[PDB]
Automatic annotation (TrEMBL), chain C:
It comes from Leishmania major. This is Putative 40S ribosomal protein S21. Belongs to the eukaryotic ribosomal protein eS21 family. One of its GO terms (cellular component) is cytoplasm. Keywords: Ribonucleoprotein, Ribosomal protein. GO terms for molecular function: structural constituent of ribosome. One of its GO terms (biological process) is endonucleolytic cleavage in ITS1 to separate SSU-rRNA from 5.8S rRNA and LSU-rRNA from tricistronic rRNA transcript (SSU-rRNA, 5.8S rRNA, LSU-rRNA). Transmembrane segments: none annotated.
Automatic annotation (TrEMBL), chain E:
This is Putative 40S ribosomal protein S15A. GO terms for cellular component: cytoplasm; cytosolic small ribosomal subunit. The keyword Ribosomal protein applies. The keyword Phosphoprotein does not apply. Keywords: Ribonucleoprotein, Ribosomal protein. It comes from Leishmania major.
TrEMBL record, chain H:
GO terms for biological process: translation. It comes from Leishmania major. Belongs to the universal ribosomal protein uS12 family. The chain holds residues 1 to 72 of 143 of the full protein. Keywords: Ribonucleoprotein, Ribosomal protein. GO terms for molecular function: structural constituent of ribosome. This is Putative 40S ribosomal protein S23. GO terms for cellular component: cytosolic small ribosomal subunit; nucleolus; ribosome.
UniProtKB/TrEMBL annotation, chain I:
It comes from the Eukaryota. Pfam families: Ribosomal_S17e (PF00833). One of its GO terms (molecular function) is structural constituent of ribosome. Belongs to the eukaryotic ribosomal protein eS17 family. Keywords: Ribonucleoprotein, Ribosomal protein. GO terms for biological process: translation. Signal peptide: none annotated. The lineage of its organism: Eukaryota, Discoba, Euglenozoa, Kinetoplastea, Metakinetoplastina. One of its GO terms (cellular component) is cytosolic small ribosomal subunit. This is Putative 40S ribosomal protein S17. PANTHER family: 40S RIBOSOMAL PROTEIN S17 (PTHR10732:SF0).
Length: 33, 209, 83, 67, 129, 100, 220, 72, 113
RNA sequence: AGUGUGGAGAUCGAAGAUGAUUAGAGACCAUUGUAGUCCACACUGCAAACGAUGACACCCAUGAAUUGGGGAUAUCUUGCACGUUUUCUGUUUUCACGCGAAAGCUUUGAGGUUACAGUCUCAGGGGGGAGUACG
């Protein structure tokens, strides 16, 4: 009720998804190196 | 006003004129004070009311009569009053001077095809607040306004203001007596030395019931 | 007064009025501007044929300062006494 | 599409409208198909009753001025 | 803090003229401000003015006659050669028939018409019309 | 679009940083003290009918000694104030009217 | 025929007022469109339609459509007027805008760029007019320049009698309702700018309604 | 309150413009080399090639057609 | 037996203006007068008009009724300072300090109150 | 909010457990409960960290109210409080001129700008990809 039309999905949850992705990539690179 | 191109004292306030003003307490107002009328205030009396400077009140009145004079066809001046205490004080005034009177319908001065469409040349009102519609309409058609204003009167679209109490029945009918008398004296129907024959009881208003 | 061609004639039509208080031009669409005539009075207290005319621009009236402007104009003109 | 043009008075509803209104209709043959035209006219009154009705309108009252 | 005394004074005069005032008080004053006002006075755009002494930077009371439309300063004070007068006239003046650009030159503070007649350049201070 | 000049609270720009929150009377939601709707309530302990029966049986409570009352200060969240009819939405032009 | 209602309309019917400049002098409103065509010859007042477009209003089960028209009048000699009206059909809107344009006539001041030879050909000073986001700025130009403007403002300037001018538009000029009014406002501003040529005072005049007040009473 | 104005402030104004020109998408494309490498043409107006096969590409909605193309 | 329509109310007012001296508080005599002075098609409408006319007559007996203006009895009802000079104005002190500041000084017959 | 090392552990309570709702209910509701919530020392440097409004300086319409200090001249207790009028600083409320696409702003600017220049400084240049990839 307090916000316009976001697009996609609640931006905070989108950011949380990107955060988890970056953590997984960091782990894979660490294993390879 | 009182000052004349030729040095004279005829248009000056005498003792008799002043006496009536204190008789009906036309010099007193209400407790609130507008910022546009500070120049007409003298001081605060008991209970918080304000005193109006009688000298400037006289000068405004005589200036108003001088403007009313030199206007041909007195019907060009309309006198309006939305207050109920001046409903007859305007008629007795108009019955003696010959001006138009009425005591409002939006569009009277603006709706050309209206049946009651009139365009007076000078408007006279009794209270700028209660006659806001009248004076607001006059602003679109280049009509000057002369008003009887108190200590808390908004002076918008008002050109000549007479500082006086327009709340009491006595004061409202008392003021129109001077205005009626002065124009007749200026016109020449009567002479200054003789007392004015008309008395204020006809101007004084009473309960219709 | 006005614009001259340097050929000798005026090319400026309708030199407009100027407000007495502020000395500003009054435009053709200024429907709040007014003109007031004040009667002259002879020594006996009877009016005279001549009259005094002044003009006030619409902006002053809407602001609510026309009454103050009129007072100072008449004091300077000597129409009324200051004291 | 349908278009309408009007001017003046026009009474509907009730029964008196059949007496005070004159109506007609026709079909007109363009190259594309049929066209309908209707015309209705509100007749003014008349004392004779030839160019209009005799009776006044059902809801009009007139007060005769005293001598 | 206040950086330009001349710009402060000219802004004060322009506002009072726009509001229809008859007198305006200017504070603080300086030699440059007084010379600018005298150029305006010579061309009839203001009336008389009075300088008051207070053992500090003084004050000025100016009488207005309603003929001023706008006055303002130019900052920074760009250099103007004798061939740049036309460019400045077309950029900040309402027309070529009235209005002045005020300069400071080796011969003193003057308007652009006087400066051109004497064949001198300088730095632009302000304008009025 | 800013709906209210005061933003629905009583905290102008250069006045305060933070105001301590309080619990709503009904639901318990935490809300700043200057934003909550506040009322003072002085209600009779007994209804008019039941008071008469108790007063009749009481040697103490007659006509020259009234019965005690309850005094409470109530603060509600916005949602609980609206549903409980304490405060209702007003037209755009009437939102400025403030009583005391 | 024409039966005047206002006092000004009766005066021009009686030929007591003959020039449009007297009306402009006292800043009086024109409420009958027959006044301006009486005081201007029928062979010199040119009118033209500028734009017509539909506006709509949503409604349960459909929508409602109307038309708006813009008209401009002038004699190409320092007089210009613009009017706009809305009607249920294009014919009705066009007729009503012609009346409104005549009632909005204002005078235009003209001057010289540099040397003063012959008739005035350009505006006397820079002016800008604003309506909505659209602003139009007019700059005096030399004798051979012509009208340098977009097709919509150029047409209006031709009807006013300006030969040479430089123009510049500011923002969202495709909104032609605002563009037309912005050009009109800039021209109307030419007679309000005090110049050194208008410094001296003039003798006061008397209102036409005051001069013929006695006759005005007789007519009614 | 958006730009510096001093008489001896040319260095600040020069640096400010240089950094803000990069925000222009058109200006940046013409002053970098990434676009030229991406362009199958090496910056030329035309190129020659060999046809590999003929394909059909469906038109995007709301149109409906099979647009005839080749791969080169 | 419900609200009176504006066509009935406007007609009843017109009748009272022109025929006031012929009417009274009786429905049955008033109806006879109306059937002579009005031309109308509906008998039912004439009954409603005679009903509301009788209502207006009763109200006019008590006092004036807005929207009538009989204009024959109003005129008759319309046609139907020395007291305070003796008493004395007795203005307050703040006014007293201002009366003598004038060029005419303190006016005669004044007090302090 | 989170992390480390020592304390503390009443209340509330991420994770988890058990009842109910429900087609499903891992949720909203009920009873609980670990980390936490609190303290000391050491990290982290993010918020609708908002007046979504950078800092300093000038001019500006009216009436209120209110906090602190000062100047001048009725009420009450027995030095205090209060009354009237001025003043400096702060902090607010009644479409000022004017501005703006509007909503709205208005001595407290979002005013004094195409009639465009008081001083310094930070950021932006259609929507995404993306605050992502590499360093
Ligand atoms: Mg905060
Ligand atoms: Mg549940
Ligand atoms: Mg628990
Ligand atoms: Zn709640």
């Amino acid at each position: 009720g307090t916000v316009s039309r976001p697009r996609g999905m609640r931006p905070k949850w989108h950011k949380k998804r990107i955060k988890r992705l970056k953590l997984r990539r960091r782990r894979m690179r660490q294993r390879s190196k | 006003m009182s000052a004349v191109e030729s040095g004279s004292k005829v248009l000056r306030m005498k003792e008799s004129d002043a006496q009536k003003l204190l008789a009906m307490r036309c010099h007193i107002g209400t407790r609130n004070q507008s910022s546009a009328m500070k120049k007409y205030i003298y001081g605060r009396t008991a209970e918080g009311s304000h005193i109006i400077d009688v000298h400037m009140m006289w000068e405004k009145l005589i200036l108003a009569a001088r403007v009313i004079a030199a206007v041909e066809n007195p019907k060009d001046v309309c006198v309006c009053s939305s207050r109920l205490y001046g409903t007859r004080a305007i008629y007795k005034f108009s019955q003696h001077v010959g001006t138009s009177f009425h005591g409002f319908i939006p569009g009277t001065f603006t709706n050309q095809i209206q049946k009651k469409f009139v365009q007076p040349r000078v408007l006279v009102v009794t209270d700028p607040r209660t006659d806001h519609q009248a004076i607001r309409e006059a602003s679109l058609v280049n009509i000057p306004v002369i008003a009887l204003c108190d200590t808390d009167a908004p002076l918008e679209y008002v050109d000549i203001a007479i500082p006086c109490n327009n709340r009491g029945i006595k004061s409202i009918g008392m003021m129109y007596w001077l205005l009626a008398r002065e124009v007749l004296r200026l016109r020449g129907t009567i002479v200054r030395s003789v007392p004015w024959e008309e008395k204020v009881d006809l101007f004084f208003y009473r309960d219709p019931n | 007064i006005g614009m001259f061609n340097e050929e000798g004639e005026n090319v400026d039509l309708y030199i407009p009025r100027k407000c007495h208080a502020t000395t500003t031009l009054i435009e053709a669409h200024d429907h709040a501007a007014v003109q007031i005539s004040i009667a002259n009075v002879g020594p006996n207290g009877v009016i005279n044929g001549t009259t005094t005319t002044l003009c006030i621009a619409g902006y002053l009236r809407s602001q609510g300062e026309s009454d103050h402007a009129i007072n100072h104009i008449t004091i300077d003109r000597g129409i009324m006494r200051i004291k | 599409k349908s278009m309408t043009f009007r001017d003046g008075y026009m009474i509907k509803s009730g029964t008196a409208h059949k007496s005070f209104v004159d109506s007609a209709c026709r079909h007109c043959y363009m190259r594309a198909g049929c066209i309908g035209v209707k015309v209705k006219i509100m007749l003014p009154g008349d004392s004779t009753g030839r160019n209009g009705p005799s009776e006044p309108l059902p809801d009009v009252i007139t007060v005769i001025e005293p001598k | 803090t206040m950086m330009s005394v001349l710009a402060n004074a000219l802004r004060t005069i322009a506002s009072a003229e726009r509001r229809g005032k008859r007198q305006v008080l200017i504070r603080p004053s300086s030699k440059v401000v007084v010379k600018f006002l005298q150029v305006m006075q010579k061309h009839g755009y203001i009336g008389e003015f009075e300088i008051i002494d207070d053992h500090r930077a003084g004050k000025i009371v100016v009488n207005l006659n309603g003929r001023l439309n706008k006055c303002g300063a130019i900052c920074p004070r760009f250099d103007c050669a004798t061939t740049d007068y036309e460019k400045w006239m077309k950029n900040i003046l309402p027309s070529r028939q009235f209005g002045f650009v005020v300069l400071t030159t080796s011969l003193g503070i003057m308007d652009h018409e006087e400066a051109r007649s004497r064949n001198t350049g300088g730095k632009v201070l302000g304008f009025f019309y | 679009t800013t709906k209210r000049r005061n933003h629905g609270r009583s905290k102008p720009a250069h006045s305060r940083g933070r105001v301590k929150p309080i619990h709503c009377f009904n639901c318990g939601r935490l809300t700043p003290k200057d934003k909550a709707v506040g009322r003072f309530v002085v209600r009779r302990m007994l209804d008019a009918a039941s008071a008469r029966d108790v007063a009749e049986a009481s040697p103490v409570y007659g006509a020259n000694f009234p019965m005690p009352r309850l005094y409470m200060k109530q603060r509600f969240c916005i949602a609980c104030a609206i549903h409980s009819r304490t405060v209702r939405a007003r037209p755009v032009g009437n939102r400025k009217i403030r009583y005391t | 025929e024409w039966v005047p209602c206002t006092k000004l309309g009766r005066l021009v019917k009686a030929q007591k007022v003959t020039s449009l400049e007297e009306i402009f002098l006292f800043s009086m409103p024109i409420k009958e469109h027959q006044i301006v065509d009486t005081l201007i010859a029928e062979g010199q007042l040119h009118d033209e339609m500028m734009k017509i477009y539909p506006v709509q209003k949503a409604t349960s089960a459909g929508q409602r459509t109307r038309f708006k028209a813009f008209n401009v009048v002038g004699d190409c000699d320092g007089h210009i007027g613009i009017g706009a009206r809305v009607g249920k059909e294009v014919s009705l809107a066009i007729r009503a805008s012609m009346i409104a344009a005549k009632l909005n006539i204002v005078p235009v001041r003209r001057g010289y760029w540099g040397n003063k030879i012959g008739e005035p050909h350009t505006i006397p000073m820079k002016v800008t007019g604003k309506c909505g986001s659209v602003a139009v700025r007019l700059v005096p130009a030399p004798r051979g320049t012509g009208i340098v403007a977009a097709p919509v403002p150029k047409k209006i300037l031709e009807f006013a009698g300006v030969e040479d001018v430089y123009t510049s538009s500011r923002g969202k000029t495709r909104t032609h309702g605002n563009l037309i009014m912005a050009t009109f406002y800039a021209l109307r501003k030419t007679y309000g700018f005090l110049t050194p040529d208008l410094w001296a005072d003039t003798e006061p005049s008397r209102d036409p309604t005051d001069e013929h007040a006695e006759l005005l009473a007789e007519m009614t | 309150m958006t730009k510096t104005n001093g008489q001896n402030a040319a260095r600040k104004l020069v640096r400010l413009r240089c950094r803000n020109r990069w925000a222009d998408k058109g200006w940046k494309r013409a002053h970098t080399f990434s676009a030229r490498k991406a362009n199958p043409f090496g910056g030329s107006s035309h190129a020659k090639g060999i046809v590999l096969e003929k394909i059909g590409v469906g038109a995007k909605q709301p149109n409906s057609a099979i647009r005839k193309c080749v791969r080169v | 037996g419900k609200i009176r329509t504006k066509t009935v109310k406007r007609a009843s007012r017109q009748v009272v203006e022109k025929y006031y001296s012929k009417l009274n508080f009786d429905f049955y005599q008033n109806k006879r007068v109306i059937m002579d002075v009005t031309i109308a098609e509906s008998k039912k409408l004439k009954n409603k008009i005679a009903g509301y006319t009788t209502h207006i007559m009763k109200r006019l007996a008590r006092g004036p009724v807005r929207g009538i203006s009989l204009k024959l009895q109003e005129e008759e009802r319309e046609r139907r300072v020395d007291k305070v000079i003796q008493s004395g104005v007795s203005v307050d002190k703040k006014t007293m300090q201002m009366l003598q500041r004038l060029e005419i000084g303190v006016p005669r017959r004044v007090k302090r109150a």
